[PDB]
Design a protein around this nucleic acid. Structure first.
Lengths: 101, 473, 317, 102, 51
DNA sequence: AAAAAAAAAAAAAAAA
RNA sequence: UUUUUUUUUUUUUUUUUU
C-alpha cells in the first residue's frame, strides 16, 4: 500500500524547512521521506527515490522556492510525481508549497 | 465528378518484427525473416558458360551501383542483405560439351530438338543428384544464346545450319522445369545474355541488351530469386486476417491431347496457426473439356475445393470462416453449386472476378504524370475499378510504361465487402518472389497460378505434382 | 510494454526518441537531432553512407491529402430516344439481306427490326416498306430499359440493353464514317485515324495529330465502345497507326507494333490525354457535345468532355 | 530431446579417459560449420498416429504403415514447403524399435 | 519388417539424406531400468557418441 | 454468318 | 525463360435470330 509522503525540495538550502516539516509530520504519525533525513547511504539514491515515488509515495509535497523552481533534481522528481499522478488518477496528488515571498 | 477513394498501401513485414513498405529496401536494411546458413549451388553447362557465371557471381558479391539510386536503390551485397553466404567456391559443376549441344540443336524438328536438349540437361542433373555425395540447394544451369534462337516454338532454324518428342511442347523452359518435378530439384534458368551482357555485342557496337544503367535491378531480382529457391522467406504479409484462404484459378490450354482440355490450376494463400503466412500452390490439375468452356465441372470443382479446405485443416484444424476466390474469368452457377455443397456452414464463400480487358484510363488534368497506385473508383457494392499498377512516389514512376489499365473487380458470387476485397488485391500484388519489384500489375495468386499452369501444361507424365513454388519460378 | 509512465527519473526529464512501433522512424529522429545538434560525422565512403542516409528518409514520398480531379476515357451520354421501336417489316425486309448496309443502324431480332428510328426512314434501301402500318410498332420507353424496369417475353433486360450498345456502336461507326476518315481494321475492333492534310497543318486546336518519324508517318487513332452497365458512356481508346506515304497503311504487323512501341516509349499522360481530347473536340458537333446519326429526327447527345472523377490524394515531382 | 542434444554437442564434451578416446571439441570448431537449433524444419507426428498403426498383430503391415506415415510426410515437406532440408533427422520412439523389427 | 531398410528404400526416388535416431541414442538420461541406472549408459562414452 | 463483349498464346522491341 | 508492361496478329466460345 502507498503510505509515504515524499518532500521535494532543494537539499542544500531548503534543508531547514524540510527537516522541520518532516519532524512535525512524523510527530503527527504521517510517514515522511526526505533525502536529508530518510535517504540511505551507499545505495542508488535516484533509483530508491524512483521506487518510493512509484510504489510507496501516497502524497507528493513540493517546496516551491526561488531555487526549487529551476534545479534539475527538483524538476525530475516533480516530473516523476506528475507521472504517478497520471497513473493513480488523483488530481490532488501533488500539493506544492510556496515558502519564498 | 465521381468520387474515388484510395486504399492504404499494402505494407509488408520484415525481420525482427520490423515493418517496411518497400521490399527491396526492407531486405537491404532489415534482412530476411529466416536464417539460411549457406547456399549450395550447382552449375550445369559448358566451360565458357561457367566463366561468365563465376564472374557475374563475383560481381554480385560486392555492392553494385544503379544509375539513378533514388528510382532504384542499388544492391549492397548478398551477404549484407540476406545475411547469408553464396560464393563461387564449393559449387558442384557439370560439363556440357559444345559438341553435344551442337549435335542436338541443329535438328530439323523443333519438338525433337527441344526434347533432346532438355533431356541432355535433366539426365545429368538426375545423375548428379542420385550418384554424388555433394548436396545442392539450388541448381543454376547456363544456356547459350543460339538455343534461345532455335529451341522455341515457331523458331525456324536457318537452312544453312540444318544438319539433321512430339507429345511435348517446343519450349525449353517449361519442359525443363516440368520433367524435373518428380525429383524435387529446384533449378533456375539463366541466359548467357542475362549473365554478363557486356561480352555480346550488336552491329552498332552497343550491346543489344543494354543493362549498364539498370544492373542493380537485375542484381536485386536474381538475389531474391536465389534466396527464395534456397529455402528462405524474403518478406511476409502482416495485414492478413485469420481463417481466410484465397485461392487463384487461371485456365491454360493443353495442346498435347486433342482439344485444349483447359487444364485448371490453383495457388493457395492464407494465415496459419501463429503468424506465418503459407503461400503454396494447389496443383491437382483438373482438365476441362470443350474448346472454350473455361468453367469447372461439378466433380472437379468439388474435388479442388475439398483438397483446398483440407490443406487448411491439416495444419490449422478448424474450417475457414470466409473464403475469397479470385479468378480471371467469370464464374457460372454450376461450379458455384459444386462449391457450396462442399463448403461448410460457417465458411462464407466469395467469388471475385478480375479482368484487364476493361478500357478505363484516368488522365490527370495537367503534367507528364499519371494516376497514383491505390486509387479506386467504386461503381457499386459489387463492382469497382482499382489501379493496382500506377505511380507510387516511392518508386517515383510507374510500374507500367504507358498509362496503366486498372483491374475490374466484380463479386460474381457470395456477398463480400467490396472494400475488403480491394484492400487485399493491392496486397496480393506485393508477394512477387520471382522478381524484386515494388509490386506486380495483377495479384500474385493469378500470376503464380498462371506460371504453374503454363508449366504443368508442358509435360505428359506428371502425377501427384509438387505444390511448392520453388520448382516453378 | 514500456509505457512512458515508468521511465527512470533522470530519463523522465529527457525527451525520448520513439522506437516502439517503428525502428526506422526512431533512427530518423536520431539523425535529425544529430544534424540539429551538430554531431561530428566522418564522411568516409561518402557514397554508401549517402545512400543509407537517403534511404532512411521511403519517407520523402508518402501519402499526402489533396483533392485531385481526374479525366477518364468515358464520354458521358446526355440524352436518349423516347422509344425503342420494333417495326414488323417481316416480308417487307428480304431475308438474305445485310442489316449493316442500312443508312441508319438497325439490328434484326426475330421478325422485328430493332432501331431508334421511325418507320419510313428506310424507303430507299427497302422500297417494299412503303405500305407499312405504324400500329405494329413495339416501341418501349428506353429510360425504363436503362432503369431495368421493363422485362417481358418479348425481350429481356439483358437482351434489351445488349441491343442498345450494338446499335449505338454502329451509330458511332456511321458517324465516324461521316467524318470521312480512313480505317485500320483490327483483329476484333475498329479504330479510325485522320488523314495527312485533312486537318490544317495536321494539327487540331494546339495539338498535332499526325506527324513524321523518319520515313514512317504516325497517325493518332481512336476506337468507339458503348457500355451501359455502370453509366451510359462511350469508351474511347487511343491508338497509333502508320502509313508509308501518308495514306496507305503498312500491312506488316511487326513493323507497326515496333513503331508504336517507339513512340509510346516517350508519350506520357499529357501526350495521350491532350491528343485524345483534341481529336474528340474535332469530332464534336458543338462546344459541349456531339450527336450520332441513327435516324431522321432522333439523336443521342454524347458529351465531348470525358467523365471526370475526383481523388483525395495527389503528389508532386 | 533432439534440441537438448543439439545444444549439448554444440558445446564440447569430455570422455572419461582422453587417452582411450579424445574429447569432442565442438561441432562448429571441428567441422568449421554452422549448425544451430534455430531454423529447424519440423513436421509433427502425433502419438495417436504412431499408436494406431503400432498396435497391430502382423509385423509386416504395421511396419509398412509406420514407414509410410513418415515417408509421406517427408516427401510432402520436400514437395510443398518453402523451407529447404539438407538432411532429415528422423527421431523414432523405442516402443517402435521394440515392436517394428523382424 | 525393419523400419530402417524399408524407410531409406522407399525415399530413394526423392534423394533425401536421412538419419534414424532412437530416443535412447539421444539423451538417454530419462530412459531408466528397474535398478535405476540407464540401460544404454554412455556417461563415459558421450564424447564418442558426439564424434 | 454476322454481331459485340470476352478469352488465351505467341512475337517483337525497350525499357526497369 | 531475370523481369515487367503495353501492344498486334490470329483464334475460339456462349446466348440469341432467320
Amino acid at each position: 500500500m502507498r503510505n509515504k509522503i515524499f518532500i521535494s525540495h532543494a537539499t542544500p538550502d531548503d534543508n531547514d524547512f524540510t527537516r522541520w516539516l518532516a519532524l512535525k509530520l512524523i510527530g503527527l504519525g504521517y510517514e515522511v521521506w526526505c533525502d536529508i533525513l530518510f535517504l540511505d547511504k551507499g545505495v542508488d539514491f535516484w533509483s530508491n527515490i524512483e521506487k518510493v515515488i512509484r510504489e510507496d509515495t501516497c502524497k507528493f509535497l513540493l517546496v516551491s522556492s526561488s531555487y526549487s523552481n529551476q534545479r534539475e533534481g527538483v524538476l525530475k522528481e516533480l516530473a516523476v510525481a506528475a507521472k504517478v499522478k497520471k497513473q493513480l488518477k488523483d488530481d490532488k496528488f501533488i500539493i506544492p508549497l510556496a515558502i519564498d515571498e | 465528378m465521381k468520387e474515388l477513394i484510395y486504399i492504404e498501401e499494402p505494407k509488408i513485414l520484415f525481420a525482427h518484427g520490423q515493418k517496411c513498405t518497400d521490399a527491396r529496401d526492407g531486405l537491404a536494411l532489415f534482412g530476411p525473416l529466416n536464417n539460411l546458413y549457406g547456399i549450395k549451388s550447382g552449375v550445369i553447362g559448358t566451360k565458357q558458360g561457367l566463366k561468365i557465371f563465376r564472374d557475374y557471381l563475383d560481381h554480385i558479391q560486392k555492392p553494385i551501383y544503379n544509375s539513378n539510386s533514388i528510382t532504384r536503390p542499388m544492391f549492397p551485397g548478398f551477404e549484407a542483405v540476406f545475411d547469408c553466404k553464396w560464393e563461387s567456391t564449393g559449387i558442384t559443376f557439370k560439363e556440357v560439351t559444345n559438341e553435344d549441344i551442337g549435335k542436338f540443336l541443329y535438328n530439323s524438328s523443333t519438338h525433337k530438338r527441344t526434347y533432346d536438349l532438355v533431356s541432355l540437361f535433366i539426365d545429368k542433373i538426375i545423375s548428379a543428384n542420385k550418384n554424388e555425395d555433394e548436396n545442392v540447394d539450388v541448381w543454376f544451369v547456363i544456356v547459350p544464346d543460339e538455343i534461345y534462337k532455335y529451341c522455341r516454338p515457331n523458331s525456324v532454324l536457318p537452312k544453312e545450319m540444318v544438319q539433321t518428342t512430339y507429345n511435348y511442347d517446343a519450349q525449353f523452359h517449361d519442359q525443363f522445369k516440368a520433367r524435373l518435378l518428380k525429383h524435387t530439384i529446384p533449378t533456375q534458368i539463366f541466359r548467357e545474355s542475362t549473365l554478363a551482357w557486356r561480352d555480346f555485342k550488336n552491329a552498332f557496337g552497343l550491346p543489344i541488351r543494354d543493362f549498364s544503367k539498370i544492373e542493380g535491378h537485375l542484381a536485386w531480382t536474381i538475389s531474391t530469386a536465389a534466396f527464395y529457391k534456397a529455402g528462405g522467406k524474403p518478406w511476409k504479409l502482416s495485414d492478413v486476417r485469420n481463417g481466410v484462404c484465397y485461392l487463384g484459378l487461371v485456365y491454360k490450354k493443353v495442346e498435347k491431347s486433342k482439344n485444349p482440355r483447359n487444364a485448371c490450376c490453383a495457388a493457395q494463400m492464407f494465415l496459419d496457426n501463429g503468424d506465418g503466412t503459407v503461400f503454396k500452390g494447389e496443383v491437382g490439375p483438373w482438365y476441362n473439356p470443350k474448346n472454350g468452356q473455361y468453367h469447372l465441372e461439378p466433380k472437379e470443382a468439388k474435388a479442388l475445393l475439398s483438397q483446398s479446405l483440407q490443406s487448411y485443416k491439416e495444419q490449422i484444424g478448424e474450417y475457414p470462416k470466409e473464403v475469397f476466390i479470385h479468378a480471371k474469368t467469370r464464374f457460372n452457377h454450376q461450379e458455384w453449386d459444386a462449391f457450396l455443397e462442399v463448403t461448410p456452414k460457417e465458411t462464407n464463400l466469395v467469388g471475385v472476378t478480375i479482368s484487364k480487358t476493361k478500357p478505363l484510363k484516368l488522365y490527370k488534368t495537367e503534367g507528364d504524370y499519371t494516376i497514383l497506385r491505390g486509387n479506386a473508383y467504386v461503381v457499386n457494392e459489387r463492382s469497382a475499378f482499382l489501379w493496382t499498377v500506377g505511380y507510387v512516389p516511392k518508386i517515383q514512376t510507374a510500374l507500367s510504361m504507358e498509362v496503366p489499365n486498372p483491374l475490374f473487380i466484380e463479386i460474381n458470387k457470395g456477398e463480400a465487402d467490396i472494400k475488403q476485397v480491394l484492400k487485399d488485391i493491392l496486397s496480393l500484388t506485393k508477394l512477387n518472389y520471382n522478381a524484386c519489384i515494388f509490386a506486380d500489375g495483377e495479384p500474385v495468386t493469378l500470376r503464380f497460378a498462371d506460371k504453374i499452369g503454363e508449366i504443368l501444361t508442358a509435360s505428359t507424365d506428371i502425377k501427384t505434382p509438387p505444390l511448392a513454388f520453388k520448382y516453378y519460378i | 510494454q514500456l509505457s512512458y509512465d515508468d521511465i527512470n527519473i533522470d530519463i523522465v526529464r529527457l525527451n525520448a526518441i520513439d522506437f516502439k512501433m517503428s525502428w526506422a522512424r526512431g533512427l530518423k529522429d536520431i539523425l535529425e537531432a544529430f544534424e540539429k545538434q551538430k554531431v561530428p560525422k566522418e564522411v568516409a565512403d561518402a557514397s554508401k553512407s549517402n545512400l543509407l542516409y537517403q534511404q532512411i528518409f521511403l519517407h520523402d514520398k508518402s501519402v499526402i491529402e489533396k483533392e485531385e480531379i481526374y479525366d477518364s476515357n468515358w464520354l458521358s451520354i446526355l440524352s436518349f430516344p423516347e422509344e425503342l421501336r420494333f417495326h414488323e417489316y417481316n416480308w417487307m425486309l428480304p431475308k438474305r439481306f445485310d442489316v449493316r448496309e442500312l443508312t441508319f443502324p438497325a439490328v434484326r431480332y426475330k421478325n422485328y427490326l430493332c432501331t431508334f428510328a421511325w418507320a419510313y426512314d428506310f424507303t430507299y434501301h427497302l422500297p417494299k416498306t412503303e405500305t407499312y402500318h405504324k400500329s405494329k410498332t413495339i416501341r418501349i420507353p428506353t429510360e425504363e430499359i436503362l432503369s431495368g424496369s421493363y422485362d417481358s417475353n418479348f425481350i429481356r433486360n439483358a437482351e434489351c440493353k445488349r441491343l442498345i450498345v450494338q446499335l449505338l456502336n454502329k451509330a458511332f461507326e456511321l458517324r465516324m464514317k461521316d467524318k470521312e476518315v480512313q480505317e485500320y481494321e483490327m483483329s476484333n475492333k475498329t479504330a479510325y485515324w485522320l488523314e495527312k492534310g485533312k486537318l490544317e497543318k495536321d494539327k487540331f486546336e494546339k495539338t498535332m495529330l499526325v506527324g513524321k518519324q523518319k520515313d514512317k508517318n504516325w497517325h493518332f487513332a481512336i476506337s468507339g465502345a458503348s457500355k451501359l452497365y455502370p453509366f451510359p458512356v462511350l469508351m474511347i481508346s487511343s491508338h497509333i497507326f502508320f502509313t508509308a506515304d501518308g495514306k496507305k497503311l503498312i500491312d506488316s504487323s511487326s513493323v507497326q507494333h515496333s513503331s508504336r512501341r517507339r513512340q509510346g516509349k516517350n508519350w506520357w499522360n499529357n501526350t495521350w490525354r491532350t491528343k485524345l481530347l483534341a481529336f474528340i473536340k474535332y469530332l464534336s458537333d458543338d462546344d459541349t457535345s456531339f450527336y450520332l446519326e441513327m435516324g431522321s429526327e432522333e439523336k443521342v447527345f454524347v458529351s465531348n468532355e470525358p467523365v471526370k472523377f475526383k481523388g483525395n490524394v495527389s503528389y508532386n515531382i
